[PDB]
Design a protein around this ligand. Sequence first.
Ligand SMILES: Cc1cccc2c1N(C(=O)n1ccnn1)CC2
Length: 267
Amino acid sequence: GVVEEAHNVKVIGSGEATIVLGHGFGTDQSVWKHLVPHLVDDYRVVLYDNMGAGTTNPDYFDFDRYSNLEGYSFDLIAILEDLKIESCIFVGHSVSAMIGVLASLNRPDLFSKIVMISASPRYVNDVDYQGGFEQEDLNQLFEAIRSNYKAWCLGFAPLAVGGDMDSIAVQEFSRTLFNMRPDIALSVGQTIFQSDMRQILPFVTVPCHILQSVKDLAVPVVVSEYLHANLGCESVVEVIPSDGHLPQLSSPDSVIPVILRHIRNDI
Ligand SMILES: Cc1cccc2c1N(C(=O)n1ccnn1)CC2
């Protein structure tokens, strides 16, 4: 199909239970490479790339459709329907956690569980809300993107990934980040980093598992507490002893067992 091709959809493993994995900004489904081997024996696993990822066709990036996160949520619902999936566990990394939340507001019937990795409803600080960024920080980021995309990618990747600045995961993410079209990276970067999902959290009904690294430059720990406090569904938080915004890529020994526990066990 065109949309499974457009999103590089892969379906692997086998189970009576389906799990769908959604990746974050700057990466692609390869971010799940250390998790998938532990899923394929028990679950049917669906991987897909968000439109605008470096692995996707820039001809298909519709700036109108993706000026809002719900454009990505509609892509996810369209993938689920075309695969004839009527129920899945959704695992959402970074922005995909909020995309998964919006999709569950539109179609709560399709999700039995949302497992969030490195999620945030809002990155900019607000009154009695610490998201971790002032508007001037984001403006500096967008200007660096415009000014020299390759230089921005090389400085950003170690900060996003954390840990040793020369690790395999920093190199992987530096590569996928630079492979994004820079005009798409700026537009998506602005859309994501300036988003605000706080208002719809009390209306979620799908149970949510809120996981993050204790040390994450884009997600202060108090964000996980905010999510837990304001999500209207039942939820649970686990702050992992790990560093970085893509911990399932860079620190699998400490992170993958935590993700598996929350996939395999319900609230
Ligand atoms: C890790 C990181 C390091 C330094 C500045 C920033 C990041 N952010 C991200 O990645 N995203 C946030 C949502 N989607 N991606 C937020 C801006």
